């Protein structure tokens, strides 16, 4: 199972790790992708997870979008986890750099409650532009299921742990 995670709350754990490497090692039931509404896995966690699946995640996502249309900001869809997980929960957090509403971050985290355990990144953090300290706060205050957060950046990980209330 998950190893070397710092316990933040009864159900939220955190580790300074590459979510791709965590997924390949653990092969969790659910890996969360930090998706956009179009499921275009270009950069950040999405580009990294997609690259780890040899683009199979993008091919599957484009078929999903052709059939269903785009996701909502704050929404999600369950697709295959390919070589990384049983499933991938593609969650759309608000992208502040593309001018989306930060209030939708709580709705985005609510999607995690439909899964008993997940390997996940901090939503709307990184290239999405939100304050990662705020994202972790919304996560622990919204998610009730077991979430194992992988924070790629060491310095960010250190800042998150040392500032967590």
Ligand X SMILES: O=C(Nc1ccccc1)Nc1cccnc1
> Which residue, 44 or 74, is less far from ligand X as judged by CB?
44
> Which residue, 17 or 71, is less far from ligand X as judged by CB?
17
Q: Which residues contact 40 (CB under 8 A, 6 or more apart)?
A: 46, 58, 61
Residue 156 Cβ vs ligand X, minimum distance, rounded to whole Å: 4
Residue 141 Cβ vs ligand X, minimum distance, rounded to whole Å: 18
Looking only at the bridges linking them, the beta strands covering 117-120 and 12-16 are unpaired
H-type helices in the chain, by residue range?
19-26, 44-52, 56-68, 105-110, 132-142, 154-163
Judged by the rule CB under 6 A, the positions of this chain that interact with ligand X are 18-20, 44-45, 48, 51-52, 126, 131-132, 152-153, 155-156
Residue 129 Cβ vs ligand X, minimum distance, rounded to whole Å: 6
> Which residue, 4 or 69, is less far from ligand X as judged by CB?
4
CA–CA dist 84, 96 (Å, integer): 28
């Amino acid at each position: 199972s998950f190893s070397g995670y710092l316990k933040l709350t009864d159900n939220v754990y955190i580790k300074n790790a590459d979510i791709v490497e965590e997924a390949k090692k653990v092969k969790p039931t659910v890996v969360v992708n930090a998706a956009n509404v179009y499921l275009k896995h270009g950069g950040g966690v999405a580009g990294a997870l997609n690259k780890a699946t040899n683009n199979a995640m993008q091919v599957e996502s484009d078929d999903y979008i052709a059939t269903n249309g785009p996701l909502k900001v704050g929404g999600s869809c369950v697709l295959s986890g390919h070589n990384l997980a049983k499933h991938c929960l593609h969650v759309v957090g608000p992208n502040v750099n593309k001018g989306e509403d930060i209030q939708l971050l709580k709705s985005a985290y609510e999607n995690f409650n439909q899964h008993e355990v997940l390997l996940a990144p901090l939503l709307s953090a990184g290239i999405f532009g939100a304050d990662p300290i705020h994202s972790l706060r919304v996560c622990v205050d919204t998610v009730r299921t077991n979430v194992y957060l992988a924070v790629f950046d060491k310095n960010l990980y250190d800042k998150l742990v040392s500032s967590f209330l």
